[model samples]
Target: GSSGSSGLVRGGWLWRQSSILRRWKRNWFALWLDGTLGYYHDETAQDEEDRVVIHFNVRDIKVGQECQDVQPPEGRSRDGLLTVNLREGSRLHLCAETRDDAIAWKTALMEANSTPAPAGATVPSGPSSG
Candidate 1:
């Protein structure tokens, strides 16, 4: 099943490997995780063509005196992505980070899902939601 303005339907199961990881030492793994929501889309069809993201933006998150900026990839539509970084900044290895560490990323995705965009603002409602 699918949820969008076009009433398109999803055909296959969702993918799990949204990012790659590097292995160095035990207890230390480097993974490039999506801000959140994991790997939920991989558009490869007409009905699901809108799944491809081509727009993105970044913002900053402040911690103590340090600040990190995150730019999330676009979703399946005009305002498709609402994910914010739970942690964004320079470190020894951004290499081993995972979505599990980002609560904001998780929360943002939940919040984004609970509320539907306004009229004309979105076009991803699928056949059922429409």
Candidate 2:
């Protein structure tokens, strides 16, 4: 286990894209310690059958508005809108309802992904003297 805290108890309403329809739908989402993004249609009462409507790992996810270039234009101009690109070639566009909320989520994801690298995976260094 790592130190400090998992720091993944984030929850909010985000407008995610539908693969088939290619449209944005407002959904409730939450982040857990295992880097899992759990989303549901209804936040108040999560029906087990549809409890986690969508689930994905947070790894390799980039948060920003730059993805608009490759995304559909339907929800691009919405306020507090942001896009998240998954390593699996899926793009999810989300709106935070407010600019501050959008920034908070962006900052949280950035910080989580920027954590210190594990010990054996350090960057290569200059040649060491024999």
RMSD of each: 14.8, 11.1
Off by over 4 Å in 2: 1-8, 44-67, 70-77, 116-130
TM-scores of all candidate predictions against the true structure: 0.21, 0.57
Cα lDDT tens digits, model 1, 22-104, are 32221211111221122222333323211211112123222211223222222322121222233233222111133333333
lDDT of 2 by residue, 1-130 (tens): 3342243458888766666897777788765444445566667536521221123423333334544443433534444666655555654556666557767776665554454433333465888898
Error of 2 at 25 (Å): 1.7
Error of 2 at 105 (Å): 1.3
lDDT of 2 at 96: 67
Candidate maximizing lDDT: 2
Off by over 4 Å in 1: 1-101, 119-130
Each prediction's whole-model lDDT (CA): 0.26, 0.54
TM-score of 1: 0.21
